[PDB]
């Protein structure tokens, strides 16, 4: 089984349709809106925004392509992936970032990238232009760090964040290592977080959704990984 | 050769995701949001809002599970699965609709279900609670006619449309057959009108975005519809 042949039609979505594109620019044009209206409400502390960086600000698809040619899933050659620093910003992504810096928000890269990439970061971050790419402003992830729950936190007690921005749900606060069922249940019951306080991308090619099927253990075989995505899925009789 | 496999991923993350659910509900709360907006500020004819069905407000991923389960490809058991009228609506959906109709807003569903398939979509919009479930609200398409420019006009000589809701671009006005260059080039020059005017909702599953890539004839061999497929991939040195 070619597992990496199962990604193809989600890769070539993310890479291709104007569809896609389209739905970066609602997210951002969402968040700028709801920037303005957090703005003019007011805050107790200094306002910050946090965002993910991988399919959320930076584009990683050609990696994932990559791994479709060569039937070599991820993380075979990610770090050199994230060594050549020439993922494409996400469309909407530096233009809302920039308009956030010119009111004065401060911007929290909040990513699961590694601490030792995040000089590697900071170069991508520079070469699109994202504004703020610093140390104190990318917090990556610790080695043995579980999610992103703790960043988040530490943000929180100098800054008001008032928007959050992410492709996957653990992006937000509440949504770490559940089921299928539970994240899907938890989605339902924050459903007015939405486009409110929590700007949500599409990413079908990977993420905790895929994880989730596997009980966030990825050391299952390629044959194991294909029945597990085959009984997941619910067919019409 | 066996092109349905290509599909798994995107399938699987559209039916189990909580992602793609948040992405449902942040779309649907961003029009409640834009509708009250366009109510406030008055219109000249009686406000519409025009909607797609299929993976806008119907859900039928089941019959793309199916085809992936079977390997067989469309249209195989399509016109079957619309005639058994057992979609499930979409996340946050029905609420908005129920919200738009106590408005005084009227819905257009314009739809490319074709108009011997109108008993079976009245059905189902029933079944799951849809307003104005008739005749008179639901836009099939016609044999002679492509794309849904012209019902889009017919609305529009007697409402003022002040939202739009699709899956696929062209859904909205200004998107029918175009290349995969020029259609992106478009969703670029109306970037303002996603999350405003046009609201879209994430479909990797299938649409004019593949189409597109076969200069919409899909009377192409699996073999060249795959070294397409394979070919539009963008990956990395
Ligand atoms: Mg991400
Ligand atoms: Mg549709």
Do not use: C
Request: glycine share 6%; hydrophobic share 35%.
């Amino acid at each position: 089984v070619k597992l990496t042949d199962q990604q193809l039609m989600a890769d070539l979505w993310y890479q291709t349709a104007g569809e896609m594109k389209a739905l970066y620019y609602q997210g951002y044009n969402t968040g700028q809106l709801k920037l303005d209206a957090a703005l003019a409400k007011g805050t107790e502390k200094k306002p910050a925004i946090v965002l993910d960086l991988d399919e959320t600000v930076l584009d990683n698809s050609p990696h994932q392509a990559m791994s479709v040619k060569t039937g070599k899933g991820y993380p075979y050659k990610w770090d050199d992936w994230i060594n050549k620093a020439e993922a494409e910003a996400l469309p909407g992504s530096i233009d809302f970032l920039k308009y956030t810096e010119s009111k004065g928000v401060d911007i929290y890269y909040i990513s699961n990238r590694k601490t030792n990439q995040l000089d590697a970061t900071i170069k991508n971050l520079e070469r699109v232009g994202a504004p703020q790419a610093t140390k104190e402003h990318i917090l990556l992830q610790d080695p043995k760090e579980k999610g992103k729950e703790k960043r988040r936190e530490l943000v929180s007690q100098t800054h008001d964040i008032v928007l959050f921005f992410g492709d996957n749900l653990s992006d937000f606060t509440g949504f770490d290592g559940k089921s299928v069922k539970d994240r899907n249940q938890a989605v339902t019951d924050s459903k007015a977080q939405f486009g409110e306080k929590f700007i949500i991308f599409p990413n079908p090619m990977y993420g905790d959704w895929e994880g989730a099927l596997y009980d966030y253990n990825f050391k299952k075989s390629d044959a194991e990984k294909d029945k597990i995505r085959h009984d997941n899925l619910k067919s019409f009789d």
